[PDB]
């Protein structure tokens, strides 16, 4: 369990670093966001199952539901960007600088 | 009760109060060709509210006592001075154009508010959609400059798409020599000092630019004078006119409510007409603005909000 | 002190409720009554200090400043009556309110027993001077001048606030008399040196010290007459009062931290007197004369002799009165000719004999004519400075020589000589402005007659 939890935290760190280093695809950014979400789900579930915390096993269900609604909101925003610009390229999102 | 979201919740639905004759009809034409009489007869025999051409003193007549104010309060622009000398160095032409566009915008807001509140249709004379015709005519005649044209286009882009286009646009096609003959027969000595080049620019701006942009989104009703000068066939066409295009079909109750708020607050209507674009034609200095604003404030009935001016007979000021 | 603060506070509803044809009359008469009421603080029949309450007090140093402010307020209204005659009623009442706010907040500032309350009222007085200069100033440089004045003063005043809070945390109450009684010596360490600089530089900016004096000439030039009065006659002396109040808890290291500021003050009054010689603007020339006089005040306060403190006090009052009179005469000439050029109006002795007489007495008070309180201040400052070091007399002599030269150069090029006959728009005199000069000059004569009132704390 400590080795696998360390691997899960490094997976979250890699997904976070991928989120922070943008590429041309906002879809890829959202996919990195759900890489973080999935890593959070596995760490929470393994922690609850290891600690036998039956009172807190609803917490993975709540993080899944809340993050899924948040990503639905983000997908709607990406749909709006793709509609206004043809593509989802993040460098098209830059006219609020001035 | 003032109109608002609470009134919309309790029930003030525009689509509920709509009927067949709840239409926006705009009559357009050249300077002197039967435009006023036809609109009056159409409104009278259709049961519609007639809005004549918004002049310089439209805001003066619609606000306060309704008497026309002084010229320095109402735009400081003279149509007679423009006719006498259109290329004057003080920028009378573009000041007159911007003031008339603001008056037309206020008139369109008033007509839209009346239609959305009472359900009665409106018949306007030469609304905001056909004032760029005068703009382009003065630009092609050299009366104004490209900076004035750009500023007018910017204001039109700021204000125009926030409202709804008219349901019907009835146009009066008329030859320039006929317009010249009617102008000579009218007898206004300033108005005979207009050029056939300017009239042809107006007519060309109409035919080349105004009629198509009405054509793909509303119903266009070009008539001659002889097709006009009898306000029965035109009303018959209005009766047998089908409105199956434009953004009026996509409007629902809450869009009507938000549009009603926009047209019922006049400050949001005239918000973008006072953008800080400093053209020397329309820029007024601090001292002249101070004097004009102050004198408008000691004008009777204009010192405080309406209903709070004791000099005009308003009562219960202390209690409200 | 409340019996002076409250009716000055109630001047504001009188201003905003008076008729537009009675506002100036009512406010001027009642502010004259405010000055008459404020004269009761001179009832000092004992060595004890007039501690009116736990928050306000009167002092032999604070009392002349309060009386001076209460006296200048009706004079301020008189000077502001003319250039606002073509102005809106609401803005006129607003300007009167701004002046009354100056007068109220300055009385509370001088009468405060707490240094933190003194600081709050310090830049609480800074705000309406900014508003007056920025709104009712004439030229286009008033905005820049307001920026310069405000930011010199605030960059000065922030380390003063930090020093005040540190002193409060170290001692416990920051009450002026408690500090004066349980004053503790300093260890002459670097922290104490920086603390001394922090609590000194705010009042040094407000004085202004030489090198940092650049906000004063442009603010005085682009300011209106009431702003010029309030600056040159109250605010510099307010910085003076701040140093006098704060210097008690700064022993012993002020005896060597006084060194750069004394040199700066002496060489700077020489420098600014030279600028007064070669200055082409009358308001600028009077402003630089004010800088030189406050440099003398710096030298006295920093050498910290009791005779020097007295000379600083009498120079505060005398220079405030004579600088206000000089700015009034300059503003009368400015309202005549619509120009500020030093050389443009020359032969005014002919057309305006009584105003030229007022010019002459104002300049004679400026150049330290005996037996005036001006010369008493400069002579006692001279005596204390020579006691501090015998070679200061050379700089004092150069300063006095150039002072006489710029005062007589003022008189010669503004009154004497041939008249500029092209200025046909020369109205003879206003009884208002002649009364303004008389009300400026008579208290100078009375304080010359009795100089014991403005001697200050030391004697």
């Amino acid at each position: 369990m400590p080795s696998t939890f360390f691997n899960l935290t490094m997976a979250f760190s890699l997904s976070l670093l991928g989120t922070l280093m943008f590429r041309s695809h906002l879809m890829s950014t959202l996919l990195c966001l759900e890489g973080m979400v999935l890593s959070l789900f596995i760490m929470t579930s393994v922690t609850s199952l290891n600690s036998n915390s039956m009172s807190s096993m609803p917490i993975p269900i709540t993080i899944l539901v809340f993050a899924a609604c948040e990503a639905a909101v983000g997908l709607a925003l990406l749909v709006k960007v793709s509609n206004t610009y043809g593509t989802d390229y993040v460098q098209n999102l830059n006219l609020l600088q001035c | 009760l003032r109109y608002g979201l609470l009134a919309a919740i309790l029930g003030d639905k525009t689509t509920k109060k709509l009927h067949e004759y709840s239409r926006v009809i705009t009559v357009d034409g050249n300077i002197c060709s039967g435009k006023n009489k036809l609109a009056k007869e159409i409104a009278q025999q259709l049961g519609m509210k007639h809005y004549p051409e918004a002049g310089i003193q439209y805001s003066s007549t619609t606000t306060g006592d309704g008497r026309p104010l002084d010229i320095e309060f109402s735009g400081s622009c003279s149509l007679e001075k423009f006719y006498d000398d259109p290329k004057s160095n003080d920028g009378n032409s573009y000041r007159l154009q911007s003031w008339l566009y603001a008056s037309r915008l206020l008139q369109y807001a008033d007509a839209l508010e009346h239609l959305l509140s009472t359900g009665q249709g409106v018949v306007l004379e030469r609304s905001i959609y056909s004032d760029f015709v005068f703009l382009e005519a003065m630009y092609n005649q050299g009366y104004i400059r490209k900076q004035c044209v750009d500023h007018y286009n910017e204001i039109k882009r700021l204000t125009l798409p926030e409202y709804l286009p008219p349901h019907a646009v009835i146009y009066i096609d008329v030859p320039v020599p006929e317009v010249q003959s009617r102008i000579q027969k009218k007898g206004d000595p300033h108005e005979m000092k207009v050029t056939s080049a300017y009239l042809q620019d107006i007519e060309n701006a109409y035919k080349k630019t105004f009629l198509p942009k009405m054509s793909e989104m509303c119903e266009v009703l070009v008539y001659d004078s002889w097709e006009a000068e009898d306000p029965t066939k035109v009303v018959e066409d209005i009766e047998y006119l089908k409105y199956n295009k434009g953004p009026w079909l996509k409007q629902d109750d809450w869009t009507f409510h938000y549009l009603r708020m926009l047209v019922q607050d006049k400050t949001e209507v005239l918000n973008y007409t006072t953008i800080p674009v400093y053209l020397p034609e329309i820029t007024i200095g601090a001292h002249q603005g101070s004097r004009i604003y102050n004198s408008f404030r000691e004008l009777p009935g204009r010192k405080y909000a309406p209903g709070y001016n004791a000099e005009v007979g308003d009562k219960w000021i202390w209690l409200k | 002190m409340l019996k002076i603060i409250l009716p000055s506070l109630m001047l504001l509803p009188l201003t905003w409720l008076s008729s537009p044809k009675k506002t100036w009359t009512n406010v001027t008469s009642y502010s004259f009554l405010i000055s008459l009421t404020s004269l009761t603080l001179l009832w000092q029949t004992d060595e004890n200090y007039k501690n009116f309450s736990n928050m306000f007090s009167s002092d032999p140093l604070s009392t002349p400043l309060i009386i001076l402010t209460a006296w200048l307020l009706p004079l301020m209204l008189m000077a502001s009556q003319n250039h606002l005659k073509k102005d809106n009623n609401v803005l006129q009442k607003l300007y009167i309110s701004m002046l009354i706010s100056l007068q109220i907040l300055l009385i509370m500032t001088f009468s405060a027993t707490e240094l933190i309350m003194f600081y709050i009222l310090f830049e609480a007085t800074l705000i309406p001077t900014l508003i007056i200069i920025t709104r009712w100033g004439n030229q286009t440089e008033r905005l820049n001048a307001g920026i310069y004045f405000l930011f010199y003063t605030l960059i000065g005043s922030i380390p003063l606030l930090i020093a005040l809070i540190l002193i409060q945390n170290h001692v416990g109450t920051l009450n002026l008399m408690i500090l004066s009684f349980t004053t503790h010596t300093l260890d002459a360490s670097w922290s104490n040196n920086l603390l001394w600089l922090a609590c000194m530089m705010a009042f040094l900016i407000k004085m202004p010290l030489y090198g940092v004096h650049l906000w004063l000439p442009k603010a005085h030039v682009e300011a209106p007459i009431a702003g010029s009065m309030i600056l040159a006659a109250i605010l510099l002396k307010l910085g003076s009062y701040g140093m006098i109040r704060i210097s008690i808890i700064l022993d012993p290291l002020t005896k060597y931290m006084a060194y750069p500021f004394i040199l700066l003050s002496l060489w700077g009054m020489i420098m600014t007197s030279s600028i007064c010689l070669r200055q082409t603007d009358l308001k600028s020339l009077i402003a630089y004369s004010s800088v030189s006089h406050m440099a003398l005040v710096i030298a006295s306060i920093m050498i910290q002799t009791p005779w020097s403190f007295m000379g600083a006090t009498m120079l505060m009052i005398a220079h405030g009165l004579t600088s206000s009179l000089l700015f009034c005469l300059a503003n009368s000439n400015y309202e005549r000719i619509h120009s500020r050029t030093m050389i443009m109006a020359r032969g005014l002795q002919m057309v305006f004999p009584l105003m030229a007489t007022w010019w002459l007495m104002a300049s004679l008070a400026n150049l330290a004519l005996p037996p005036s309180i001006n010369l008493m201040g400069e002579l006692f400052i001279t005596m204390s400075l020579f006691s501090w070091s015998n070679f200061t007399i050379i700089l004092m002599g150069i300063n006095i020589i150039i002072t006489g030269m710029y005062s007589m150069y003022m008189i010669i090029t503004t009154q004497r000589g041939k008249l500029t006959n092209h200025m046909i728009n020369l109205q003879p005199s206003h009884t208002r402005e002649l009364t303004l000069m008389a009300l400026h000059m008579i208290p100078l004569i009375l304080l010359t007659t009795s100089p014991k009132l403005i001697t200050g704390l030391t004697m």
Binding site: - | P280, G285 | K22, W24, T28, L33, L39, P74, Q427, L446
Partner: protein, 99 residues
């Protein structure tokens, strides 16, 4: 050119009101403001206040200190005491440190 009011010219105020006193345009407010400034400036402030200041007694106890000085000089001269002691404080009631 932007619209702007022309530069006003200051008028000869004495042309329409030869008895102008500097305070207000019409004669009545001008003369009453002049009277108010004269009566409240010189009459009941520069004279009544001057009298009050002149008749403040014993201002910071110069007169009392003079009387006490004369009394102390008389005391110390009829009893042979020094006029001023070299030490303000009595040396017996001060505990100096041992080093």
């Amino acid at each position: 050119q932007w619209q702007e009011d022309p530069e006003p010219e200051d008028e000869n105020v004495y042309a329409k009101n030869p008895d102008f006193h500097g305070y207000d345009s019409d004669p009545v407010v001008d003369v009453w403001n002049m009277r108010a400034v004269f009566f409240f400036g010189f009459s009941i402030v520069l004279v009544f206040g001057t009298t009050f200041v002149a008749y403040v007694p014993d201002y910071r106890m110069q007169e009392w200190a003079r009387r006490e000085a004369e009394r102390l000089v008389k005391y110390r001269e009829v009893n042979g005491l020094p006029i001023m002691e070299s030490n303000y404080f009595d040396p017996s009631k001060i505990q100096l440190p041992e080093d």
